[PDB]
Amino acid sequence: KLERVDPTTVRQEGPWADPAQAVVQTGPNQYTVYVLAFAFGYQPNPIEVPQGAEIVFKITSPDVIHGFHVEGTNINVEVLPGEVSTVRYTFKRPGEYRIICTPHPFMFGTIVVKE
Ligand SMILES: [Cu+2]
């Protein structure tokens, strides 16, 4: 069901290698966001997306299992090394959202949804 990726090369080549290129416009009101869930943080940080846009999160791990839950939303997904977790969401409220990892409570990320 989930797309496969080589976890040993995910940080050197491909769409998760450069966090400055994590946000790719794939349509007029559509963005794909390549998120790396690693020990112990998120890449990019912060994730910046416009409000009302369809976001396609493509999340993967180069090490161990991580969680990807965006507080105040129903986004609650497991992130496995070598597998791509896909989350589709449209943020209707601008502001800052916290990304939470259940196994690592010291691991935090930020999403900024712009007006
Ligand atoms: Cu974690």
Curated annotation (Swiss-Prot):
One of its GO terms (cellular component) is plasma membrane. It is found in: Cell membrane. The keyword RNA-binding does not apply. InterPro entries: Ba3_CcO_II_C (IPR034214), CcO_II-like_C (IPR002429), Copper_CuA (IPR001505), Cupredoxin (IPR008972), NosZ/Cyto_c_oxidase_sub2 (IPR051403). Coiled coil: none annotated. Keywords: Cell membrane, Copper, Electron transport, Membrane, Metal-binding, Respiratory chain, Translocase, Transmembrane, Transport. It is a peripheral membrane protein. Transmembrane segments: none annotated. GO terms for molecular function: copper ion binding; cytochrome-c oxidase activity. SUPFAM superfamilies: Cupredoxins (SSF49503). Belongs to the cytochrome c oxidase subunit 2 family. PANTHER family: CYTOCHROME C OXIDASE SUBUNIT II, NITROUS-OXIDE REDUCTASE. This is Cytochrome c oxidase subunit 2.
